[PDB]
């Protein structure tokens, strides 16, 4: 029950995760002029294309497309990662109006909405472990801008009709997460934490610099969605974000310049 209302949002995770206000939460606002380029980065390696998604489904907090990661398909690996992580979803936080709706910031720049490609580290077995880990987890997070549309994203947009509410599934296969991404793959990464509860440190985050655009019309539809579950007083599903935590100390890395 918790979600990002006034009475069970952000504010009030702390009481029931502790961890809330821990010393390595997400998400960060990124400061790039504090940023410093990290030559021991090597390679970002995005390798998605035998991807193989399953399921889409409304979680009452934001829609989470499945994939198959019972075998070294679509992984991440490279950059500040060791070893190899298998991606299990994705998902998206988004706004009510197109001014906010990203966690992460750029020198306080709120972007419209934010995606997060979410992986395991595969040394230790299944995600379940991997949460239990210091470096157990790997989100990639892309910005999304309101402008032209992302043709790689309206098979998402299109399907989102059929779980507009809580609970609700639909078979999603064949989905190709690489329309998904932007040209460039420079990016920033700090170690974090999961923005919703549990809140576990666990993370390795990966933002990428260059924001993905998508249409007005397209964001619109993420708007429509349902908190609440059928047969259930509607509460669209808009500000499903979490705001900046402390950074306390940590250092956020650039593969650029
Ligand atoms: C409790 O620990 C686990 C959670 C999950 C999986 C494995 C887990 O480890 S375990 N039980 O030891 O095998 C495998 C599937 C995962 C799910 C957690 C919730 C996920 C990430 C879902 O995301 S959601 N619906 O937004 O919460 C999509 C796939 C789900
Ligand atoms: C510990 O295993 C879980 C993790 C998550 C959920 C349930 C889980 O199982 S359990 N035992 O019921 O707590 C439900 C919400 C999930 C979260 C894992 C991290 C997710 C996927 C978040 O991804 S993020 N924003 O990149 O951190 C979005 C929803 C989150
Ligand atoms: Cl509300
Ligand atoms: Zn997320």
Same mark, same amino acid.
């Given at each position: 029950?918790? &979600?990002?209302?006034?009475?069970?949002?952000?504010?009030?995770?702390?009481?029931?995760?502790?961890?809330?206000?821990?010393?390595?939460?997400?998400?960060?606002?990124?400061?790039?002029?504090? %940023?410093?380029?990290?030559?021991?980065?090597?390679?970002?390696?995005?390798?998605?294309?035998?991807?193989?998604?399953?399921?889409?489904?409304?979680? &009452?907090?934001?829609?989470?497309?499945?994939?198959?990661?019972?075998?070294?398909? %679509?992984?991440?690996?490279?950059?500040?990662?060791?070893?190899?992580?298998?991606?299990?979803?994705?998902?998206?936080?988004? &706004?009510?109006?197109?001014?906010?709706?990203?966690?992460?910031?750029?020198?306080?720049?709120?972007?419209? %909405?934010?995606?997060?490609?979410?992986?395991?580290?595969?040394?230790?077995? +299944?995600?379940?472990?991997?949460?239990?880990?210091?470096?157990?987890?790997?989100?990639?997070?892309?910005?999304?801008?309101?402008?032209?549309?992302?043709?790689?994203?309206?098979?998402?947009?299109?399907?989102?009709?059929?779980?507009?509410?809580?609970?609700?599934? %639909?078979?999603?296969?064949? $989905?190709?997460?690489?329309?998904?991404?932007?040209?460039?793959?420079?990016?920033?990464?700090?170690?974090?934490?999961?923005?919703?509860?549990?809140?576990? *440190?666990?993370?390795?985050?990966?933002?990428?610099?260059?924001?993905?655009?998508?249409?007005?019309?397209?964001?619109?539809? $993420?708007?429509?969605?349902?908190?609440?579950?059928?047969?259930?007083? *509607?509460?669209?599903?808009? +500000?499903?974000?979490?705001?900046?935590?402390?950074?306390?100390?940590?250092?956020?890395?650039?593969?650029?310049?």
């Amino acid at each position: 029950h918790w &979600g990002y209302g006034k009475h069970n949002g952000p504010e009030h995770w702390h009481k029931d995760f502790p961890i809330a206000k821990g010393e390595r939460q997400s998400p960060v606002d990124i400061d790039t002029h504090t %940023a410093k380029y990290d030559p021991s980065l090597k390679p970002l390696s995005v390798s998605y294309d035998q991807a193989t998604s399953l399921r889409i489904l409304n979680n &009452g907090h934001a829609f989470n497309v499945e994939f198959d990661d019972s075998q070294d398909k %679509a992984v991440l690996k490279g950059g500040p990662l060791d070893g190899t992580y298998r991606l299990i979803q994705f998902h998206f936080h988004w &706004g009510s109006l197109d001014g906010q709706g990203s966690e992460h910031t750029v020198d306080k720049k709120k972007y419209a %909405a934010e995606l997060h490609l979410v992986h395991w580290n595969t040394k230790y077995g +299944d995600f379940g472990k991997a949460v239990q880990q210091p470096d157990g987890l790997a989100v990639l997070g892309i910005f999304l801008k309101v402008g032209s549309a992302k043709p790689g994203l309206q098979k998402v947009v299109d399907v989102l009709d059929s779980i507009k509410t809580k609970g609700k599934s %639909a078979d999603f296969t064949n $989905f190709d997460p690489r329309g998904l991404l932007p040209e460039s793959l420079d990016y920033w990464t700090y170690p974090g934490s999961l923005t919703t509860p549990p809140l576990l *440190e666990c993370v390795t985050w990966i933002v990428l610099k260059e924001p993905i655009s998508v249409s007005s019309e397209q964001v619109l539809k $993420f708007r429509k969605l349902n908190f609440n579950g059928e047969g259930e007083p *509607e509460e669209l599903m808009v +500000d499903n974000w979490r705001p900046a935590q402390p950074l306390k100390n940590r250092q956020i890395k650039a593969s650029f310049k």
